[PDB]
Structure formats: structure tokens, C-alpha cells
Amino acid sequence: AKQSLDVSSDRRKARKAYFTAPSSQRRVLLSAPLSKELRAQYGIKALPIRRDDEVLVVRGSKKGQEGKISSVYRLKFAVQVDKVTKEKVNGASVPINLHPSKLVITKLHLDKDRKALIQRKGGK
Amino acid sequence: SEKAGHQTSAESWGTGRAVARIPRVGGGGTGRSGQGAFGNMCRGGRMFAPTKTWRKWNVKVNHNEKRYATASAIAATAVASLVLARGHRVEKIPEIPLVVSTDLESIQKTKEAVAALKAVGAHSDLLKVLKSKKLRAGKGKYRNRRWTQRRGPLVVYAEDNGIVKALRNVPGVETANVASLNLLQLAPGAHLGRFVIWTEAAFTKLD
Amino acid sequence: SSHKTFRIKRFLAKKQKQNRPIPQWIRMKTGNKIRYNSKRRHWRRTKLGL
Amino acid sequence: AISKNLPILKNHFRKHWQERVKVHFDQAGKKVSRRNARATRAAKIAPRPLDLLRPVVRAPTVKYNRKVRAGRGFTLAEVKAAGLTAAYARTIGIAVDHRRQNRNQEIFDANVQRLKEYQSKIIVFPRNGKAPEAEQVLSAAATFPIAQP
RNA sequence: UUGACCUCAAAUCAGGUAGGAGUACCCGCUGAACUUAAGCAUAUCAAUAAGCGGAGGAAAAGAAACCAACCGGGAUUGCCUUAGUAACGGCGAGUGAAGCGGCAAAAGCUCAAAUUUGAAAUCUGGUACCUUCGGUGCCCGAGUUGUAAUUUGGAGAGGGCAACUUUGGGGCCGUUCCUUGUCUAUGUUCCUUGGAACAGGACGUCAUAGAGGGUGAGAAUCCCGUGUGGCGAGGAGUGCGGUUCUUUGUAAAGUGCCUUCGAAGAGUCGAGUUGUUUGGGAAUGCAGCUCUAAGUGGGUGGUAAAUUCCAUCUAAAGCUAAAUAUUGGCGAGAGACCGAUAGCGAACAAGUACAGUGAUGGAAAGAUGAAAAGAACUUUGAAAAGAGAGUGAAAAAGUACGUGAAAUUGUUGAAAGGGAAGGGCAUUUGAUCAGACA
RNA sequence: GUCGAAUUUGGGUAUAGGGGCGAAAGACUAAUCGAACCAUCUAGUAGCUGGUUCCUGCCGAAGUUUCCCUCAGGAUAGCAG
């Protein structure tokens, strides 16, 4: 239960903060959990989603499909996978928007900042 | 708002123009012009008898009469028929009132607190609270009252050495000091027969 | 009239540029509810009143 | 507007009274604020008792002259009889009232006794700055209650 | 002639300062009427609205020319009470305080009036330098028509005598306060339904975390957060908890006894009169005009006056935190409040569109679907479109889009109808239908 | 009807609400005049007109007395629950 006077349980305020969140804050909101192999390897539970990350779909009609993150559409609160698309009647193909909470990260794109974040969260 | 429905310079047209004598908005060129105003029967008007803040909200109750109700509620907790009729699952409870050891006041973890409560026969009452969670049936859902559930056991102690924190997260379970018992908890909804679990120290202190 | 001050002419210039339909590509943006320009003006219907 | 056997009423509501209605919705909130203010002042100021010692005086008027209560401050003669100056007394936590006079020997003796007991039950820390830590008593009035003679 | 002084000017002289906005609350001025009195003029509404001037985070008030009549109390403000009381009032309608008592908060003070007279001891500015919210040296100026020290009535001052007691101004590191950052638990395991599991069933885990929100339907355990703690960053104020650099200073303050003294605010107090105001009534406060004081004096003591006492304060000069107020501004937390004709006029490109010469007046308008997957292609038509096909869980969701009521209307089916129609009781005819087969 | 004048008229300017202007009709002062328009006081008062939202059960009236600037209204007694 809530124990602080600086946090509010008002439903109206919570929804307004979510839909009007700036781009930097939507990055934290768009986090995905790691796989069992990566959870043991690094020692952390979840990370914010990043482009060029290998993911697996674990919910919805696209369950079982894999791919790489080709676009993080923060404005739409969604991500797009390179090989997860829909074919229109005219023959054109459009990406399918997926929520990162319904995905599982199977491979991480690593650089200097990502490694420091992992060590900052107590990972190895 | 005290100004609601009166932010208008509307004035009655009087008789002779084949319309009702209600005040009407002046001017022209907007559609709002000529419409009724200031009336409780008019769209955009003022409600009849607008609500005021100086309505009586709190109610005085005599101090001795208040204690009479509290004593009646405490005595009702010792009657098995009243406790059962209030919806508590005390069918196979050995003895009412139920008194447990004083060491319950020193439990620090939620896991062991639940295990102790289940061991004395409160398992069925705890399961009732979990299975009764429901969505509210009206416009109170988006007024920060979204879910409803039943009331569980009440645990009464003499000294708090961790029991309050250990049971804080358990749904339907509330703790009360023996010295400051609350009628709102002893007879929820003005219904006697709350399931109360007393510690040994609290039971002695009742005298 | 032909004789006009600079202030009037500058005022008329802005009203001419504001009298145009909304670009089509704007309606394709995410979360767009604007369909037609609600502040369109015609010289014979509504007068500027300067 | 007069009918039946009823008392005559004098309800004064012929002005714009609704514009000047004060409802004390913040009664609970102000109590929290006052308790917070007392708590923060006690920590901030000193291990001092948060209040000044007051003398015992006779209430005026024939209706209330049978009781004694707390006055504003000790007189200049009372503090002089206790072996201290008025200027030093104010800095040690003793209220001084220069406009009150002494005409009753019993009241004068009682107030002198209060000053004697106060000086024997306090510790004045030196100005060097050592200031050994001492327990803070929050009420000098409770320590020195006033009793009816 | 020359050089001062006094008064009065000028400069795009050196450096400053005032205006306007906002105005919920605060300090003043000015000032109605509707209304009530069942008419109406005094009265009431009201010392209110409108108008005008001036502030702050609070303002204002404030350390008694007070209250009292007691065994006296002791700055101001606010709450409870006094009290709908004393009193005012065509004594009608109506109006209406204050002392005491309990409580919240508490805090005290300083100028004028004295010869530094063996020393204007005081201060702005300029300039150089410096450890720059300032300091030092120097040079003009202000000022004796009075700038410092010393004393403000509680006192206090000039002399004489005898004694001890008590410190000042900075750095650094902590602590407090505020503004922020980061880290810190537990299933997405099986079966059924479904487009989607966040539903149901089964088996588990965490809990000082079962607040709240998100994610394709009701998610503690999928995501953000929540709970409990840890580790940082940047400022404010000297409030204090420690350490450290300076001896301030033949400095400053306090206390006993004797003696001589003890300055205390003027067109002001007060009085008459006129107007206004107050519960204040032979006159409560305020203001105009006229008169105009005293020093063992002066004010007050709620009935005018003379005379005799008593009580109580010390006006005509000044400053000061907290308890109090707040429909404005900024930042937060909430509700037995409203749910798109409601709630602010405005949930939307709303003080917008539009109207008026102008002051001003002032709307209507929220919902496809989980995702546009917003209908390729074929065919008829000049075209809009239609008929197919297709997308979708659903086109009985097609940008005239959730659900889609009534008035009113089309088609189809049944029935009746010789200047209305509709209704009540009863049964015929047609259509239609439940109940027991025990 | 009048048509060379006490003529007709454009623009500039002056007079503002108990005020203006009037060869005078209480005329005119932005379709508004025996006192303009706008906002506020203001939800002004009304013994007067209109309206006043579900069912069943039991009981069940008065238009008369006295007083009132009382006569379309109240008080008072009566009748009623």
C-alpha cells in the first residue's frame, strides 16, 4: 500500500502522466524482460528496449516468431520487428506494432553505455 | 461554483412577443442569443438551491453513549451465532473468543504471520477475502473506488513489536491496539459479530 | 480604397495568407483530428471590420 | 409573519451574511501544523524548555478573586529578592513584567520561592561552547505547577 | 577691485530613484439605491456594491495617557465564552459591543529634551590599492541653525567610597533545510474458451511491496511503479555539533552604600459649535471653523454641574517575529461531488467562430477497430456511385463510422372503414399462446 | 409642393443622458426617446397570474366570529388530522 505523501493513487493523474510523457521518459516505460539464458548470464530482470536487439514474441497471434528490433516507435508506445509484418491486399507490406512487455530479449546490443548500465544495476 | 449559471447579462423580454417571460441572452449572431437563462429549467442555467459548503458534515455523539456501542460490539464478538451470521467462516473454530500466544506480537515477516493465522483456524476466512474481489457496480469506479472485497479477521494486540507491519499487506486483515478499539471495525456496516483474534496480553488488559 | 495607409495594407496582407485550405499531409499525422479549416473567410460573406 | 404561541426570535441575518461564512474544515489540519511547529521549534531552538517560567498572581474581580493563576512575569522587586538582575533573568528563561507591583506579602513570598526552586533545578551551560548534552524537558509549567493556597 | 556667506537657477553634469501590471487576502478615502418597515420621510439594507489612492507574503496592531474597584490584573492578534446580553431604536421594524474566565502564540524596545568643549570624537562621494554584499590610505564635501558616544521614566545622570564577576571577530569540516539523480522482491508453468488471456481450472513464489497505471477483456508475481533501505550531485542559511587562525583591551558591561539632581513632545490637550459616525445614551470616534492651556501638572474612572477626596495610567515622536487572513500566483495530496443539455462559458485550433460604430455580447462541437488491416482486382455507368470480390472476431463497425430509443417516413403482410377517431362491460369469429398429462 | 434662395449638399469640427439639440412636433439624439445604449448592484420586491413529478390504505373540511388604511390579504376562534 501507499505510504508516502509525495505519491498519488489518483487514476486521473496517472493516466495523464502516461499519455503526456516526454520521449525520454517513454524509454523507461518501454522496457522488456530478458530471457532465462540472459537472466542467468547477466543477473538482471529487465532492460529498456533498444534498436538492433534480438527478441522473441511470447504473447498474441505472433507468438513464437523472432527477429531484430528495427524501430522503437516511442510516439506510438510500440516497437517494430524486421520480419514480423502484415501483407496488404495490394501486395504492400506494413510493420506490426508490438508492445515490449509482450516480448523477451534473446540478444543484447552492447556498447560502452549499455555495459555501464548493466553493472550499475548489479549485473555482470 | 457560486457563479455557475449567472455569468450572463440576460434580461426578460416581457409579454407581448408570444414567448415565455424567462430572461433571455441579448445580442445576436451566435445562436446563444435569445436563449433562456438563469432558470433551473433552462439549459446552462443555475440549479435549484445550489449546494453549499456549510452543510453539516460531522455529527456529534455523546461520549458515554459512544462507549455503550463499543462495549456491545466487543461482547458480540464472543457469540458464535452472531459471528457466523456476519459472514465469517468460523464453522470449525474450536473456541470463541479465540486467544493466541503473546509471541504473535513479535512476528516480523508476512509469510510467518499468515502461517500462524492459518494454524489457529483462520485459513478459511482469509481465502474468502481473496475470492471475493470484484469490480464496483457504478460511477464510483473512476472516483478512486474501483474494487470491493469482504472483511477478514481482526487481530488485537497489547504491544506492537512487528505484528502491524507483518499483516499490513494481507488482504482483509486489520490490526488494532486493545486500548483504542474502533466501532467501525468491530461492527462493519453496523453488523455485529466481527471475527476477532486476541493475543494473550491483550485479552488480560481488557479488565 | 486605392488610398490606404501602410498599417491597413499590412493588415490585409496577413488576412490573405491565412485564407487557405489545410495541407493534406497534416491529416495523416498520428493523433490528428483536424479535417477542415474552421477559420476560412470569403470577402462577400464575412467582413474584416477594420 | 406572526402566528401561534411561539417565542420571539432575533436571528440577525438581514445583511449579506453568506459572503462571510467561515467553516473550520481545517481543524484537524491546523492541529497537525501546530504539533509540527512545536516539534520543529523544540529541536531548533535549544535543549531549553520551549516556554518561560511564570509567576502566580491573584485573579481580579470579586467573582474570580478566590483563585490564583499564572501571571505574565515576575516583578522587578521579586527578581531582586531572588538574587539576580532583570536583564540576566530574561536570558535564563524567566519572564519579567515591569508594570506589575507587589502589595501582598503572601503573593510576594510565593513568587520568591518559585524563583529559588527554578534556579536549583536548572543547569546553565557555560559560554565557552563545551555544552554537555542534557535531556530536554519540554514544559517548565509542568515541572513547576501552580497550587491553590 | 577681489574673496566669502545666504537664497535661487542651469547642464545629454556623476550616481540613483518613482510611474505600469496583478489585486483572493491587507491599509485608507469616497459612497448609493433596490430591499425591510405589509404605505412612508427617521431608521433598515450599510458605515455594504460601484468609484479612487497605497502595500506585503502576510498586512495591520503592538510594549498602556489600558482594564479595573478586586486579596487586583498587565504589549498586540486569534479561538471558546461573555451575548442576541448592557445599550441604541417613528423604543416601531430592527440593531448591538466591552471588562473578567479557558486556550493558541509569546519578545522586547528607542528617539527629542543634558557642554565631547583638554580638542566633530560622526558621515556621503571621488581616487589608489586590496582578502570586493566590503576594507584601508589620501583628497574635496556635508555638518556647530548640532553629526557621534552617553540616558528614555521599568528609570537614569553628575560626584564620593568599597569590591569582585563577565567576552571579540573570522576560516575549515560536520549537522540541519531545500532542489535533484541512481540502485534495491516474486510465474508470464500446464488445461479449456477466445481475434487477443489480463477470463476459468490446476500447481507455485514474493510480501515493511495485494496503492495506482500500462500492456489486443477483471494482471501483487509481463512492464513502470509501490514498500524498505543504500550510495551520490548542486545550493541556501551561521540555527549549532566539532576543529582551527587571530587577543581583541591600560577596552566594554554588570552589581553595593552615601550625596546632589532628575531635562520627558503646543494651534496640541481641552472647550464651544456644525456635519458625519457609534451599542455609547446632557453627546463613541473622526473632521471643519472659533477659542486656546497647565507643571505636586495632564488624561481616564460610561448622567450634565459646583465643592471635597480617592484610584489608575503618562498623550500630543518612533521600531518590532509568532499565533490570524487569503475565490489571485506557483507546487502537491484528496472527495458518500458532476459525468458531454451535467460539471467552469470552454473535456475539442474557447474567450475561439460570429454580432455590434462602440462599451460589450458570446456559442455549437467528445467515442470506427486490438491493429487501417481505410476495401487490391472484375464488371455496369460520362461521373457520383452500384453489383461482386476482399480485410476483420464483427462491414447488424465503411472516415455520413460504438451502442442506435421516440416523434416522423418507405416497402411488405394482416384487418377494418355510409359526415371523425379512440374507450367501458359481455360474447361470436380469426390469429396466437402457457399450464397437467402421474 | 418648391426650384437662385431663410437654397441643396460632401468632408472637417463642436455640443452627451435629467444632459444635449429644437423656425417648438415632446420632436430628434445609430430601426431605441414624456429621459439613449452597455455592464453591475440583481436571483431587486410582488397581498397578483401560471406551474409544481410514484402507488395503495384510513380519517376528512371551510367560505362563519372579533380586530386590522381590513374589502383579491392577514391575525384570532371554529371546523380537521
Added chain:
RNA sequence: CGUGGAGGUCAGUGACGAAGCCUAGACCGUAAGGUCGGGUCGAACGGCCUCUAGUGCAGAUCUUGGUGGUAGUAGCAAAUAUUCAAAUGAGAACUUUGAAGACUGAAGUGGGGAAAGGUUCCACGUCAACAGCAGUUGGACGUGGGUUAGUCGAUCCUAAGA
């Protein structure tokens, strides 16, 4: 009896379809009303014990919005007036061209301006709405182009006045 919201309870109902709506189909109650089946629909809602109110409409020349009969009715008749052919087009009494007949008759239905309007000016494209019939045309709709000063005005002067 019914309605919005609140405490308690029925471990109440529900995407295998909650609420709402339609239904000369059924059942209960003297009645206010309650219950069920069928159709439509898509996400919440009810029974009982109590609490609370911005709680029940046929009327107020009621408020706002929507819709009828009247009714394919009144009417679309001032300003003398139109006709033939071709071109264009899906479509021509109304557009374009040619021919004919007419009018304004110089105080004009001609040629320029002041005030006022503000792009209506010109070309190309185009006809859902607007031009109270029509429309291929337009002062309409869409996209572009266009206003050149030492000598013309403003600017300067003063008038009543401010």
C-alpha cells in the same frame, strides 16, 4: 414501489456474452412495479440488511434539440425581347462564335474617380456545395501570376477646432 451514490453481506451474475434497446410472446402483484423467453448488442452489473440525496413529469404562451400536418401547396408575373445555325460536351431555352431582331439614346445600361470593400483583377485547371429553373459558364472551388514615380498624391502650411 422505483432512481444516482455509500457501509456490510450473498467466497452473487458475466466475453460459453454484463448493461442498454426492440419484442397485439409467457408469469406474479389491487397498484406503484417485478420476473422469464426471443432478437439486437459488446464490458460491466445485481439480490438482501442499512446509510444518503441535485431521487420519479403531460402541461408552466416551460428550456434545448429533433420532427410533422399544412404541401409538391402559396408562389418563382416591375425595369418593351427574343430567334436561327454551328462549335463544345455524358447532358445546352441559359457557355462560345456567326447571323438576325431590339434597347440604353451623351443628366446613358457610355468613359473615369472620392468614401467603403480587400484580391472580387488576370491565366490555367475544375462543378460536390453556392448563382431561390438550369449550367459545360461565373464576383463559385483549386493552383499560380500581377500594383515599378525627383515631376501624380501623402509628406509641408494653416482653418473651425484639438
Added chain:
RNA sequence: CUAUCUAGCGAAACCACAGCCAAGGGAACGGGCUUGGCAGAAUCAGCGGGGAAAGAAGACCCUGUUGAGCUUGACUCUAGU
């Protein structure tokens, strides 16, 4: 030139429900009620008897302890002098 008929276009007033009479009684002049006369689809152009037709909460008159303009040795005041 309309009206009239056709193609196109297309309103409003008004509307409790409606629309055949005679007498009767009735709020003392009925489309409805009572007793009789009667009474047959759907309609077009005219017409002004009736619908006490429509247009406006009667300006006349009275009432109200409702106003306003104007007058005067009405009551009470007031600028100026």
C-alpha cells in the same frame, strides 16, 4: 401581366382532438352531450356564411397600500443668492 395546366424549384401563418344540420337543456348563442333529420370512395376551380378564424398576457374601465412624465404656498428638503 396574373390566376389556370405542365417541367424544374419550393416556404409560412396556424394546429387539444377534430370538422353535416334543427331544437333542447347547458357558464343563459354546440363540431362533440340528449332527441330527431340523415348519411357512400377519391377529388378540381371558385367563394367569403361559419369555425364566437388568425395576428397582441385589453391601450378603454376597475382593483393594487405597483410606477413614471408634468403642475402647484401638498408634506419634507436642496444648488444658488
Added chain:
RNA sequence: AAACUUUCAACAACGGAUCUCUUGGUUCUCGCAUCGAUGAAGAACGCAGCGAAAUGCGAUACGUAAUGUGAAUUGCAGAAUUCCGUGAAUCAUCGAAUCUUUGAACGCACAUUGCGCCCCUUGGUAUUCCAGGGGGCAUGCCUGUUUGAGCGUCAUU
């Protein structure tokens, strides 16, 4: 007998009630004290690859600098090297700047984008005329500086 009129049902119209939904309103409570001549509030006109409005901004114009985060923005186009890095971003923070014409509005005026004066500098064969660039010129009041006025008045020639 049809047409017509009326009543009911189904389907289709008209219309937008009802139900459910809510980034809004309303009321209560808590904390804080910060506008402007160092040019405010407000107004006008402009600024984007493709923008009318809203929002943001000022010719450095949906932004510049700085700090933080660490890879987007997104309707399309484009740019890509900005991706193990002084670095993506319609991001956050914000202490340095820019800030058109105005406005208490300040050279004088303003129904005018009207008309002067002073200083420095540049060009036109120029201290004087014309033009470009930069910097200035309001009022009341206070303290000081400097230059003065009056037989108001002193002393000395």
C-alpha cells in the same frame, strides 16, 4: 374489388435518446512567496523541406550556447556517420546569449511605417550638401560636481 386512411409487426429510413466510457470541471486540505525603466502584463507583424490554426520562437526566429540522459525523429521526403561516442532526440534540465515593431514607453510626432539634433566612422573631388554603419537626446525628485543670478548681504580695495 383496388386506390386511399388508420392500427400492429419485420426490414430499411430519419434523428441522436439510452447504456458504457473520460488526459475535463468542481470542492476541501497542505506547502511556498517570485512582475516591471537591467523595459513588465498586453498588442502587432514575422520565423519550418512540405503549415492555415493551436503550441513554440524573434532576422541567431517550432530555435543558439551550456548541463544531463545514451540512440532516435516519424505523415512523407531527406540526412545518414550521429552509434564501444564531447553523441541521435518535436527528450529532459537550464545558470550563457539572441530578443523584429510596439507597449508604464522615454528626441518630437503617430488615422503618417512622418520629422529633427548630437558624437564616432565610411563613400560621393566635402566641418557646411547627400547617403551607409555604430552610439546617443523624456519627466518629477534626491545626493554630489561644475557654471552662474540677486545693493538678500559681509569683509577688504
